[PDB]
Design a protein around this ligand. Structure first.
Ligand SMILES: *C/C=C1/C(=C/c2[nH]c(/C=C3[NH+]=C(/C=C4\NC(=O)C(C=C)=C4C)C(C)=C\3CCC(=O)O)c(CCC(=O)O)c2C)NC(=O)[C@H]1C
Ligand SMILES: *C/C=C1/C(=C/c2[nH]c(/C=C3[NH+]=C(/C=C4\NC(=O)C(C=C)=C4C)C(C)=C\3CCC(=O)O)c(CCC(=O)O)c2C)NC(=O)[C@H]1C
Lengths: 315, 313
């Protein structure tokens, strides 16, 4: 039965059990994963409102100094570019990316998107023809099976992940592993099917709009935003569009129990519906840098197109 | 059918026999790169472009005996695996060579039956592609998508004019969006007859998705031999971007005052929906890595055109 979200934990909401799965407001956890930092800022003035508690250590500045400046002063070269790329009223799915040379922290990748009157800024550390070669190989795959196999093998070669599966949704939202590339010694998940509650309904809706999400370390504690609520609204900060957003504790226990240290997945979206997932596992924690993740994002789109094409060749 | 090419004493091309020019077998290439053909098994260099000596820095005869194994040691096994016998002519493999004579070359290979076609071009060596991809996806409708696409391509390439040219059901073409330098004529809204892009050229554009003319006044460079030794027949060059452009179509560019021209197929439901069409007033060799960006954009636009057309119908 579909039911509306509970309030999050920090607003006195209940703790999540197997009973109330579909009602966890996973998009507003009030916290991020510790391998990057996040700031929120007023979309018109550029006043800095919220920051992750670890921000001082990524950005090399005291909180009170950060919060006391506008983005115009903090990001003089990027602030006008942000404002042109992310105009008021734009969708929350639109992202702008730049690379910064920050004194204390080396090269940072900056990813920005806009939710209403809020700008959300994510900072992460950042670092030949493999993509072009893959694009052509995907297109020349003769059928859906060969496409799925080429796609899994390519992603594994690009990333070094221990296990890469193509996980396809059935009409009842159960899912099945239809191809996989895996490290020697791992047991096969090929042909196994998994029940529709394994990836509940509010996560599938979110995965149709925001196409990549990850868990770099399944044992890492989440880092709170400070303050936790958006001071504009005294309400929760929407993080569904932020790759740094903390992962559901329910989902992290599910991965730990499987022996997974690091998890990543790309959505494959066909005709406006979530067709499947490029799902990756690593046994140890593992951070895939932003520019490599971009390659996977591009492959997500290519695969969406090629899945349509291969399936049309099939009636 | 097709007329024989000129160099096999076929008729010269007019506006009476527009549909019958064998644009895939011109026997020559554009001079900003070099092409070798080679045997699929032996790696034996069978044809070369008369200009190969320039790019490769090799005494002419040296090449036309040697083997790819010898000539490209690191690459030759990769090719063997990447382009297995029986693969499609559409499948391409690329690498960057740090080659003694020329700082860096791009190498592009595909296979047509028993022949490997190798293309060499100068090359080199950020977020504009990722930023463009998200911009295309958030365009609210087909019109805005067209506008974003043309603007994005112009910004990435510096081309004087970028158009989105859409085919009607009878192959009548219409410029539905345009991004252009100040002080050019506007081709926005204009329609053009179907024979401007003749049937045999639309079929080729459905399979091989990027073509260009780097300099509309440059002479083609012959293949030597012109005929493939294997077959004593013309080498198919339809999947080669270095392939010489139809003199008929270069005359049409010169008469417009274009000095360089590039397009990308937008393919939807197995059919040619439209072209990303680019103009430069002067000669312009777009480097291979930037062309790759446009090739990606072509696929992304193909996806988004279907998405956007579905939310009208
Ligand atoms: C009562 C709650 C439960 C629950 C919640 C939940 N699950 C996700 C997301 C995912 N669950 C996945 C499950 C699988 N992993 C596999 O390897 C297989 C099969 C081989 C299955 C079925 C997957 C793949 C995802 C997507 C993310 C990923 O790829 O790692 C969420 C949302 C997480 C978030 O967005 O932060 C939630 C809340 N899952 C259950 O099984 C029950 C106990
Ligand atoms: C007797 C045959 C004729 C003919 C042949 C021909 N045309 C092409 C390719 C193209 N023609 C194009 C025409 C236009 N360019 C524009 O900018 C506009 C309008 C604003 C039109 C109508 C285009 C866009 C192409 C595609 C290639 C490109 O982007 O430059 C070929 C194929 C050449 C090749 O692939 O090597 C041929 C044989 N064109 C005619 O107009 C008649 C006279």
């Amino acid at each position: 039965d579909p039911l509306p979200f509970f309030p999050p934990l920090y607003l006195g909401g209940p703790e999540i059990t197997t009973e109330n799965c579909e009602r966890e407001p996973i998009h507003i956890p009030g916290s991020i994963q510790p391998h990057g930092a996040l700031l929120t800022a007023d979309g018109h003035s550029g006043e800095v409102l919220q920051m992750s508690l670890n921000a001082a250590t990524f950005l090399g500045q005291e909180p009170t100094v950060l919060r006391g400046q506008t983005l115009a002063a903090l990001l003089p070269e990027q602030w006008p570019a942000l404002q042109a790329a992310l105009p008021p009223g734009c969708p929350d799915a639109l992202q702008y990316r730049a690379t910064l040379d920050w004194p204390a922290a080396g090269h940072l990748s900056l990813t920005v998107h806009r939710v209403g009157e809020l700008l959300i800024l994510e900072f992460e550390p950042t670092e030949p023809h493999a993509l072009r070669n893959a694009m052509f190989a995907l297109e020349s795959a003769p059928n859906l099976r060969a496409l799925a196999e080429v796609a899994t093998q390519t992603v594994r070669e690009l990333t070094g992940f221990d296990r890469v599966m193509l996980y396809k949704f059935a009409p009842d939202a159960t899912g099945e592993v239809i191809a996989e590339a895996r490290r020697e010694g791992l047991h096969a998940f090929l042909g196994h099917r998994f029940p529709a509650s394994d990836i509940p309904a509010q996560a599938r809706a979110l995965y149709t709009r925001h196409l990549l999400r990850l868990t770099a370390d399944t044992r890492a504690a989440a880092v709170p935003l400070d303050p936790v609520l958006n001071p504009q609204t005294n309400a929760p900060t929407p993080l569904g569009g932020a790759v740094l957003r903390a992962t559901s504790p329910m989902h992290m226990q599910y991965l730990r129990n499987m022996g997974v240290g690091s998890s990543l997945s790309v959505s494959v979206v066909v005709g406006g519906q979530l067709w499947g997932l490029i799902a990756c596992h690593h046994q140890t924690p593992y951070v895939l840098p932003p520019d490599l993740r971009t390659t996977l994002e591009y492959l997500g789109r290519l695969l969406s197109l090629q899945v349509q094409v291969k399936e049309a060749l099939e009636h």
